[PDB]
Amino acid sequence: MNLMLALLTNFTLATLLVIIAFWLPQLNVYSEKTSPYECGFDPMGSARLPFSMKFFLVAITFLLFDLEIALLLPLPWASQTANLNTMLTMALFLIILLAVSLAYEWTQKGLEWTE
Amino acid sequence: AERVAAFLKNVWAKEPVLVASFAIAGLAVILPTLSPYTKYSLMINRATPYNYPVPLRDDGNMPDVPSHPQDPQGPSLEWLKRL
Amino acid sequence: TYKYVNLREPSMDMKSVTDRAAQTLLWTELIRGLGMTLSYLFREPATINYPFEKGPLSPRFRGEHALRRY
Amino acid sequence: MFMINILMLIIPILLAVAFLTLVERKVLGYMQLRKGPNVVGPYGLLQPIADAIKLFIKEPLRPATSSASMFILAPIMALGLALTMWIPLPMPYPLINMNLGVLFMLAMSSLAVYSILWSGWASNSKYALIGALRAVAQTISYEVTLAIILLSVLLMSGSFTLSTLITTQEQMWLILPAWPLAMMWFISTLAETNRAPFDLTEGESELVSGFNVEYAAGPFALFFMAEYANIIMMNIFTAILFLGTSHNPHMPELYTINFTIKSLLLTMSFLWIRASYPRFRYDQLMHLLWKNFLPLTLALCMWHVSLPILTSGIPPQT
Amino acid sequence: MMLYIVFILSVIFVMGFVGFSSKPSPIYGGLGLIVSGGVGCGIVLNFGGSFLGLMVFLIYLGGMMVVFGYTTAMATEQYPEIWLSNKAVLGAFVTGLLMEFFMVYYVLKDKEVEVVFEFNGLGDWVIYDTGDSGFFSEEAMGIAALYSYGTWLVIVTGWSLLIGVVVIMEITRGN
Amino acid sequence: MWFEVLPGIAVMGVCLFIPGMATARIHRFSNGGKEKRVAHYPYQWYLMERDRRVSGVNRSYVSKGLENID
Amino acid sequence: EMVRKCDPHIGLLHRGTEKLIEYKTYLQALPYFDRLDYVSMMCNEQAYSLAV
Amino acid sequence: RGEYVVAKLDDLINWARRSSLWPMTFGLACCAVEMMHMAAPRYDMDRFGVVFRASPRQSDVMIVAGTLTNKMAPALRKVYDQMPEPRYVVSMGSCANGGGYYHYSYSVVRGCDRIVPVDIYVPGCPPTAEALLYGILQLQKKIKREKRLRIWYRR
Numbered sequence A: 001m002n003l004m005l006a007l008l009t010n011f012t013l014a015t016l017l018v019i020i021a022f023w024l025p026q027l028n029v030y031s032e033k034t035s036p037y038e039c040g041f042d043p044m045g046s047a048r049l050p051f052s053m054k055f056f057l058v059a060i061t062f063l064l065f066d067l068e069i070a071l072l073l074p075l076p077w078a079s080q081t082a083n084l085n086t087m088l089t090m091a092l093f094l095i096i097l098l099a100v101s102l103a104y105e106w107t108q109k110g111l112e113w114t115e
Numbered sequence B: 001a002e003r004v005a006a007f008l009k010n011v012w013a014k015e016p017v018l019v020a021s022f023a024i025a026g027l028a029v030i031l032p033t034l035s036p037y038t039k040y041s042l043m044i045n046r047a048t049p050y051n052y053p054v055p056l057r058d059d060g061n062m063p064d065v066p067s068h069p070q071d072p073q074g075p076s077l078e079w080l081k082r083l
Numbered sequence C: 001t002y003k004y005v006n007l008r009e010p011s012m013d014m015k016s017v018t019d020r021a022a023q024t025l026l027w028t029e030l031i032r033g034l035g036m037t038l039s040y041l042f043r044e045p046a047t048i049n050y051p052f053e054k055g056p057l058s059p060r061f062r063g064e065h066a067l068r069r070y
Numbered sequence D: 001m002f003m004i005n006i007l008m009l010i011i012p013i014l015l016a017v018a019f020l021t022l023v024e025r026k027v028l029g030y031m032q033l034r035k036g037p038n039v040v041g042p043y044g045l046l047q048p049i050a051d052a053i054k055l056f057i058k059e060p061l062r063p064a065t066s067s068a069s070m071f072i073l074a075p076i077m078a079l080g081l082a083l084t085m086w087i088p089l090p091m092p093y094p095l096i097n098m099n100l101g102v103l104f105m106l107a108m109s110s111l112a113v114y115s116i117l118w119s120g121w122a123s124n125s126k127y128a129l130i131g132a133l134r135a136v137a138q139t140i141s142y143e144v145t146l147a148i149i150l151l152s153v154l155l156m157s158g159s160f161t162l163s164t165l166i167t168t169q170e171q172m173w174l175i176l177p178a179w180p181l182a183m184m185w186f187i188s189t190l191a192e193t194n195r196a197p198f199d200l201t202e203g204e205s206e207l208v209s210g211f212n213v214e215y216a217a218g219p220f221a222l223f224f225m226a227e228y229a230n231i232i233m234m235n236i237f238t239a240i241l242f243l244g245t246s247h248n249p250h251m252p253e254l255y256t257i258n259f260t261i262k263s264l265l266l267t268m269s270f271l272w273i274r275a276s277y278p279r280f281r282y283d284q285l286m287h288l289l290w291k292n293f294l295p296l297t298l299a300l301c302m303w304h305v306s307l308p309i310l311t312s313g314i315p316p317q318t
Numbered sequence E: 001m002m003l004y005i006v007f008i009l010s011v012i013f014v015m016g017f018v019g020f021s022s023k024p025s026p027i028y029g030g031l032g033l034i035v036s037g038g039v040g041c042g043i044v045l046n047f048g049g050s051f052l053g054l055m056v057f058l059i060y061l062g063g064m065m066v067v068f069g070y071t072t073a074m075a076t077e078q079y080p081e082i083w084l085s086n087k088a089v090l091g092a093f094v095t096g097l098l099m100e101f102f103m104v105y106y107v108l109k110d111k112e113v114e115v116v117f118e119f120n121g122l123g124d125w126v127i128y129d130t131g132d133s134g135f136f137s138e139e140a141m142g143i144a145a146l147y148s149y150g151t152w153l154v155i156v157t158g159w160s161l162l163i164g165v166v167v168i169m170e171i172t173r174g175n
Numbered sequence F: 001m002w003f004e005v006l007p008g009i010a011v012m013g014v015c016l017f018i019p020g021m022a023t024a025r026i027h028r029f030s031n032g033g034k035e036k037r038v039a040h041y042p043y044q045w046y047l048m049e050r051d052r053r054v055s056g057v058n059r060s061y062v063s064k065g066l067e068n069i070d
Numbered sequence G: 001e002m003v004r005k006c007d008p009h010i011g012l013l014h015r016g017t018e019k020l021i022e023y024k025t026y027l028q029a030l031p032y033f034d035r036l037d038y039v040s041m042m043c044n045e046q047a048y049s050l051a052v
Numbered sequence H: 001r002g003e004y005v006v007a008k009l010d011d012l013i014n015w016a017r018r019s020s021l022w023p024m025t026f027g028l029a030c031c032a033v034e035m036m037h038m039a040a041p042r043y044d045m046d047r048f049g050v051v052f053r054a055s056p057r058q059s060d061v062m063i064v065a066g067t068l069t070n071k072m073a074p075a076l077r078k079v080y081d082q083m084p085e086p087r088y089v090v091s092m093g094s095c096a097n098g099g100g101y102y103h104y105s106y107s108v109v110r111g112c113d114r115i116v117p118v119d120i121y122v123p124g125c126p127p128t129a130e131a132l133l134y135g136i137l138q139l140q141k142k143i144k145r146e147k148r149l150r151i152w153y154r155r
């Protein structure tokens, strides 16, 4: 409720400013003005052409490393249990395996961008 | 022993950040085993009363179950107060 | 005559290696740059208040032409 | 009275953003032996007003090649989410008291990247596209590290509630036991806000203007407003995390004054850092946060999970 | 009304699925998955789970950010397709909406729809629990037990992630 | 000089102080001069909903003391 | 962002300086050298001076 | 009178525009060196509210500082056409005024005014940084005299 109003107000204000920006000023539109910007000379090829990603391997590793926060963020609550010996063992076990995962991709040239 | 203090010196010169990492992570796996206070972390967690202490039915043969909360029987948190 | 600009070898004694390790971890040489710009903040700016203050010139200045008389 | 409370939040934020532009231009000027704005109003106090009016009465143009709906949505999304990062902030009483405030700010921060990605892609320009793909690279660099750093600091606090960080730091600041995390958090906020030396999504010297190269007039202002509102918000987050202020229930004003000063000084440091260092390469940023911070962050996450247990100092759950 | 908040979010949840199921440019497909992942946080959040709601949303924002980068590199053409650019995409988008509309229309009028399963339309609030919990969040307690009870789940999930990194490097080595 | 930068900081500082001050006063205004109730867990909410019934005016911040027992 | 080929297209500041110097006396051609490397003005004059 | 109120609004927008002039980062030849010295500490054009921005779409002024060649002329008009209005052009130096030292060259445009409209001409080879700053201040006073709203009102 209070969150819905806070969200509703924040985006309504942003939408009004955009509305004002497009309707308050004087407009003068012609083809040259709206042409794509590439430093004064016409572009060669569409901007929609493929753009190679040289860090693709790190991007995939990001997904696997971005899950660990899901599994590691519950740790503050997990520390409130009576089985600290078990909880501590499996908390360090999960982080150690992440370190091994980073170590493998590092030593195997996986963090180095393709040329 | 001379060689051992030549690989450590090389990594400390070429990768100091990794030397700190393995030291901090190493101390995290060992100290909990050696620390005398690891028992109290487990005892404090047990002493935290999330649930209601449902009473037992006095059958006349439970000498170690307190009749009243202010009775000497039952677990005591005297250790925790002085910790 | 000449001189090398980047021909040096860092001493490998333990104290020096630890000094560099502290620099790498504690960002010592990045804080000198902060100190250098901090000092400039407290120096008087060199900005003149144009058009009320004009940059100095000399009699030889070559500006707008004019036709002279006796 | 809640609508008034929201207005008493967003409206001051915009004024703070407006005059943070003036402060940056003068602070950089004096660090560069200049004065900065001192003509438009006494000591340049009316400069933000002139720039705001100028941009909103200037012609906005949609590029002929742009995707119109994404082109207009992106600036709205940036400012809308920029203001949304403030509602869980305890100063000392939050507008929306969230039990998971820390997690809410992470999700909103990630969602705010798409205002950069979609603005660049919708522009249909090569320079806007290159800057947008630097945002992908830059978010892959800090997002994982930034979460674990927060996790290590919450293992001394107890929960994800931001108001609970005030209770944690009542006897002492968190920057003493966790200055190694504070250093890596501070540099992670620079990357997250796209600030120098990590201003790669824009990269004036490399990409002219980056993702917002095609935007002009009012639409450009929203991106500018969001960027500066994020600097203050993140520096408020840093103060609450590592420079917690003492809370007196009967004098909440004293908290705001001390808490406000700590945020300004952290905000000045952002201006200070922009005037001192060159710009990273967006592939060197990835190696910085994956080969230096991440190995240490994982080690400090193990240490901060074991340290409370081996000293019997586990914080309360509630 | 505010008593139908979950149902309203669920309708938006479906509309986001008809967004990327019509298969426009993966740029717009990834936008529908962000929308459905945001309301999905809201639906799960209204049933008592806030960590789950903010975690799936947090995870799916990371995934779509990588997918956006891959789309501009592997899955782009000169004219990316919008929902109005193909009769195939538009037909799938309109068909999905008209099917959601009739499911909503019948479940709100009759309050009873039978498609494979018997569904009721008295409001999602009628099945909630009438007894408050204690001084803790039940979902947080359950997730926090992954490290005390779910030791075997931690080992298999931990091993899978480690093997995941090894696997992707082998697949992408080439030559 | 460097102290001509301060006026901008003062205006910025006053603007960042308002959000905290307004929330504190508005909370006290709308809760009978007390802090807004923090209900993070269901037990705290159950006690807040109980306060509304006890109040008799449908407000959880209208507390009834020992004058209500007899 | 990897560069495969740099192809510097120059001549956007070609003004025919070398052709103009042919219609100017040696004194009249001196200021043309202040405007070649316009960051090193008195070093371009000197090279031309030593040549003449 | 209603023409008094528009005149005050006309003053407001005029004030907002001359106090926030953003030149395009566009230099061609030696005259750009004197354009940097205007941004240097001694003159500090930034204190007048004048800030360079690289994108033509985020600029209000084009300072054509240097020689304009036939190869560069199409590019100059392109970045000028892409500036959102209102936009102003300041011609700096003899080369951009009337061709200057290279007026009779086969590869030089005899004046940037052949390609784009010009509002202020700054003479010199090069103009001093104090002469360009005088030109920008003359442009501001030229914007102060605009009466768009008092001409719209009288239509």
Ligand SMILES: CCCCCCCCCCCCCCCCCC(=O)OC[C@H](COP(=O)(O)OCCN)OC(=O)CCCCCCCCCCCCCCCCC
Pocket (backbone or CB within 6 Å): A096, A099, A100, A103, A107, B022, B023, B024, B025, B026, B027, B029
């Ligand atoms: C009970 C369970 C807890 C124990 C967990 C067991 C797993 C531990 C490891 C988990 C983290 C993964 C790291 C393992 C890989 C180590 C790094 C590595 O393999 O790098 C290989 C390295 C290649 O480097 P290169 O380019 O060839 O140049 C240098 C020449 N060596 O060349 C090399 O040969 C590496 C050099 C030797 C590295 C030794 C690493 C030792 C790590 C443990 C240190 C613990 C001691 C510190 C704590 C002490 C207490 C304070």
Ligand code: SF4
Pocket (backbone or CB within 6 Å): G035, H029, H030, H031, H065, H066, H067, H092, H093, H094, H095, H096, H100, H101, H124, H125, H126, H127
């Ligand atoms: S006018 Fe003079 S200074 Fe300017 S470009 Fe031409 S020759 Fe160089």
